[PDB]
Paper text:
Almost all prokaryotic genomes encode toxin–antitoxin (TA) systems. These loci consist of bicistronic operons that encode for a bacterial toxin and its cognate inhibitor, which neutralizes the toxin under dormant conditions. The epsilon/zeta and the PezAT system form similar heterotetrameric complexes in which two antitoxin molecules inhibit two toxins. In conclusion, we have demonstrated that zeta and PezT toxins are UNAG kinases that form UDP-N-acetylglucosamine-3′-phosphate (UNAG-3P) from UNAG using ATP and Mg2+ as a cofactor. We further showed that the formation of UNAG-3P yields a potent inhibitor of the enzyme MurA, which synthesizes the first committed step of bacterial cell wall synthesis.
Once bound to the antitoxin, side chain groups of the antitoxin block the ATP binding site. The second substrate binding site, however, remains unaffected by the antitoxin. Thus, we surmised that PezT and zeta toxins are still able to bind UNAG even if they are inhibited by the antitoxin. Indeed, we could determine the crystal structure of the epsilon/zeta TA complex from S. pyogenes bound to UNAG at 2.7 Å resolution. UNAG binds to a deep cleft at the molecular surface of the zeta toxin. The side chain group of Asp67 forms a hydrogen bond (3.2 Å) to the 3′-hydroxyl group of the amino sugar moiety of UNAG. Based on superposition with structurally related phosphotransferases, this particular side chain of the zeta toxin had been suggested to be the catalytic base, which deprotonates the substrate. Thr118 of the zeta toxin formed a hydrogen bond with an oxygen atom of the β-phosphate group of UNAG (2.8 Å), and exchange of this conserved residue in the PezT toxin to a valine residue also yielded a nontoxic variant. Additional specific contacts between the zeta toxin and UNAG are electrostatic interactions of Arg120 with the phosphate groups of UDP. Apart from van der Waals interactions, specific hydrogen bonds are formed between Thr128 and the uracil base and between Glu100 and the 2′-hydroxyl group of the UDP ribose.
Residue numbers in the entry:
A (entry chain A): 3 to 87
B (entry chain B): 3 to 274
C (entry chain C): 2 to 86
D (entry chain D): 2 to 272
């Protein structure tokens, strides 16, 4: 438990929640079938689900930084795909 | 009125939340709940770590803030109230937090309930409600110097802004100061209630500084005050100041009172 | 039935997806990681890709295909960066 | 040995995964059909995959030799050495893999799409015969596409992949394209004569059937293919393709190539 790692974990939690919620909201709002991985946005939701399953407390800084940049990437990407009305 | 939402919209999000939270966790015959305390910026995620270890990973973290953006009409609410969106989506997050605590405690999973310790009554009602379901209730709090936590809020904000400008919201100074002011007295109060089998103080580095179980006649009040009011050496805040400047430069936030403070402090710490 | 425009995307997506997925596959096999332990960062990535690769591309709009093109550019960027120890 | 080689265990592992991915949502059938693909590079043989996906209603497995190139255990090390001239070195691997996949998957009798160009009579004949003595019906669907359009296709493909990954990109040699074009009409007639195929089809870029040996058993695929291969393309039709590659080549920063300079003189002759 270094503050450096604790801090990164705090930031990752907030960002991953933001991204997940944008995807969850859109999937729910557009009434998309959660059990259909063929549907692009659902596939993405399922991918985010796997990502969140990990115990971040078992990661090193380099691994945490890697996870962080994962969520920057999905944040960027999710905004791009969700353009329906 | 976009601030409202249907009971179904709630149920759907409640159901997803529950799936997510019970993943890999297991309800037990003798569940524990760990309520958290500490001002914004104090690094309470450190507490989650210790509890994860203590429960061997069989704990569910419940965190109000992770629900705010889950409001069904969230994006329509920022395009209307912008920076001030938090107060409009708190009713949703509150109702969601409570529903989730209710259901998970119905089953009997181990819980971590994130919170600041701004009051005694909220942790009290929580502990009391959980006890009526067979939970042992503990309280784990962060003891962190007021200057370290305040720098923590700043850094958090600027690191978030660097990832996403829309998502980032500054912690207001009051939210930080009120908890710093209330906490020590609130802990002595909670201590006297006897509801908590253990009250613990941890520091930034994860070191347990106090335990009501181990020293049941010493109150947590003084130990916490020593730490909130500890004078922090120039040499101790420097790395944090350096990281803040780095993000602030990147975010083009040079023209703030904060940045000029941080820049002056960093120049005063240079080897003459 | 199908346009050149869309099929040209699919062809590109395929060569790219194979390139990204294989990088991750190579890393996982060569470093002898338990493919069943989704807690491992590199194995969690693989599993997401196994998931993204599991779709019928012939059933997407051109808009959707471009989104999928964009995804595998992300994973390309990300995979290279994360296996870059 | 060393970097170019790989242990049987290493191959074994990658085979297991490949098979695992490929079987996703597929059943084995009792009349398994193998579709062997044909067409010069840049044809857009992906068009065929969609026609076959439709024909088999999703229950078909695509075996594409290219998708294994980067799967060589040591590939990483083989770029720190050979960079853009790496393809040659890994082809041994990818050929072995494909043949083990085609092998194990045909033991179980899944419907198969096998990626090919039709440069040789040897390969499809050898494949078709191997598969028939195993219960497979064997067909051959081939792109019938103007040489200019397919040559432009190779150019576009490379230019798009350069924009994806400036390191992975390597163009198809014009001679490699032009050989399949010179050989294919005659190769299809030789195949026609073997009677190994229940149907040889010619498809244009829009998925439109131009020929079927089953429909027209005494007509050669040869005349019909040559005619499309050689068909001259109007400035009308070639207008967008030129514009698109041109604008992609500015981002890739490739003005100073004979290919780009030849586009300018086609775009100038039509203004
Ligand atoms: C997808 C593919 O393979 N074609 C590639 C091959 O062209 P190429 O013209 O070599 O493609 P072929 O159709 O001849 O097949 C190549 C190899 O794939 C395997 N195979 C193919 C067909 C078949 O029915 N059975 C079979 O086993 C064989 O090992 C064969 O030797 O190299 C070119 C570079 O020069 C690439 O641009 C092509 O993408």
């Amino acid at each position: 438990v270094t503050y450096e790692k604790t801090f990164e974990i705090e930031i990752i939690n907030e960002l991953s929640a933001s991204v997940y919620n944008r995807v969850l909201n859109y999937v729910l709002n557009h009434e998309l079938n959660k059990n259909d991985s063929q549907l692009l946005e659902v596939n993405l939701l399922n991918q985010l689900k796997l990502a969140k399953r990990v115990n971040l407390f078992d990661y090193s800084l380099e691994e945490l930084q890697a996870v962080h940049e994962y969520w920057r990437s999905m944040n960027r990407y999710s905004k791009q795909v969700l353009n329906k009305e | 009125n976009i601030v409202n939402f249907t009971d179904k919209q709630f149920e759907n999000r409640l159901n997803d939340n529950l799936e997510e939270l019970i993943q890999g966790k297991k309800a037990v015959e003798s569940p524990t709940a760990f309520l958290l305390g500490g001002q914004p910026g104090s690094g309470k995620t450190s507490l989650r770590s210790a509890i994860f270890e203590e429960t061997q990973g069989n704990v569910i973290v419940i965190d109000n803030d992770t629900f705010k953006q889950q409001h069904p009409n969230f994006d329509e609410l920022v395009k209307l109230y912008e920076k001030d969106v938090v107060k409009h989506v708190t009713p949703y997050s509150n109702r969601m937090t409570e529903a989730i605590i209710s259901r998970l405690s119905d089953q009997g999973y181990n819980l971590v309930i994130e919170g600041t310790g701004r009051t005694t009554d909220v942790p009290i009602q929580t502990a009391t409600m959980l006890q009526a379901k067979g939970y042992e209730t503990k309280m784990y709090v962060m003891a962190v110097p007021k200057i370290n936590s305040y720098l923590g809020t700043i850094e958090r904000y600027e690191t978030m802004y660097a990832d996403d400008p829309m998502t980032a919201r500054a912690t207001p100074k009051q939210a930080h100061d009120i908890v710093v002011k209330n906490l020590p007295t609130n802990l002595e109060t909670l201590h006297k209630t006897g509801l908590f089998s253990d009250i613990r103080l941890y520091n930034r580095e994860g070191v347990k500084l106090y335990s009501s179980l181990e020293t049941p006649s010493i109150s947590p009040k003084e130990t916490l005050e020593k730490e909130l009011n500890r004078k922090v050496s120039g040499k101790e805040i420097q790395p944090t100041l350096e990281r803040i400047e780095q993000k602030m430069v990147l975010n083009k936030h040079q023209e703030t009172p904060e940045f000029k403070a941080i820049q002056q402090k960093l120049e005063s710490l240079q080897p003459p």
